[PDB]
Symmetry: C2
Subunit: 177 residues, 2 copies
């Protein structure tokens, strides 16, 4: 109904008003909680050629160890690298839905499961035809996601992609001079 | 309505998939006609310091006089300069709501009326509190703009604000190259 409509208008408004990123994305993450269930959310940005991922923003309810607390890490040959072309939302059981899962090549995933996380949602972020990042949720319980929930998350993510791409361009401008 | 929600989702999606900016705005504009009945639209960029505005995108159903055609022009002392702090959408009768009308200070206004436009709407384009430009519509008929109409225009303008902001960033970026 108008619930999703109003959330998008709110995000839109927030984007064109709130000046600093860290407080923008807090406000946005908090409001997402009116439509979507999750315990923890992160925005990750992707460097396809360097095969790397960076934490762009986080709102965590757990605390992970330090080695896995790096802002940037390789994703070469990891489960995530296989979602670099996604158009739609992914809702996966950490321990069942991901073939990498083990202490082996998915240490992160293994540690998340260890922490008592059970479910991870991926919502791809696009700009100019390229996936530039993901919005992600992580939860202790397996939250039920209908196709329509997923569609609504896609739509709201369009907005976030928007905001994230803007920031990224203010960065690329900053470090070009 | 559902048509409103989809309109936003569609725009968010166009923005994340369409590499070419001119066809991005042709596409987004035409989709705006399904919910908004208007003659012609324009996207204008503002330069508050220099007191100028530039035509960024146009989708007109009429030609303008040679002398009103310019890419870049002064808005110093114009009725537009008074809307540079606007948060909300302005809907206005050309001959009744604009004090600059008729005076030689608003020749563009005059032509539009001459051309048979009667209502114009301003939608501020905003990125982090500052107005960077305007989306604007003209119609010969003075349609009723509900608050819900205006909210829709605002929310959708939000995304278009960041699309244009981004375009301007990449432009600078390809000069620093």
């Amino acid at each position: 109904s108008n619930a999703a409509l109003k959330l998008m208008q709110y995000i839109g408004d927030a984007i064109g008003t709130i000046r600093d990123p860290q407080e923008l994305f807090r406000t946005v993450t908090d409001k997402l909680r009116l439509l979507f269930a999750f315990d923890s959310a992160v925005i990750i940005t992707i460097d396809r050629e360097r095969r790397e991922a960076s934490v762009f923003f986080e709102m965590l309810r757990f605390e992970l160890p330090e080695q896995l607390r790096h802002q940037t890490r390789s994703i070469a040959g990891t489960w995530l690298e296989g979602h670099l072309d996604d158009r739609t939302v992914t809702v996966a059981s950490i321990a069942r839905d991901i073939p990498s899962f083990g202490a082996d090549g998915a240490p992160l995933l293994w540690t998340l499961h260890e922490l008592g996380m059970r479910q991870i949602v991926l919502s791809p972020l696009r700009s100019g035809g390229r996936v530039i990042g993901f919005l992600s949720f992580v939860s202790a319980e397996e939250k039920l996601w209908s196709d329509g929930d997923k569609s609504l998350l896609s739509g709201v993510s369009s907005s976030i992609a928007i905001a994230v791409s803007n920031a990224l361009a203010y960065e690329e401008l900053r470090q070009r001079e």
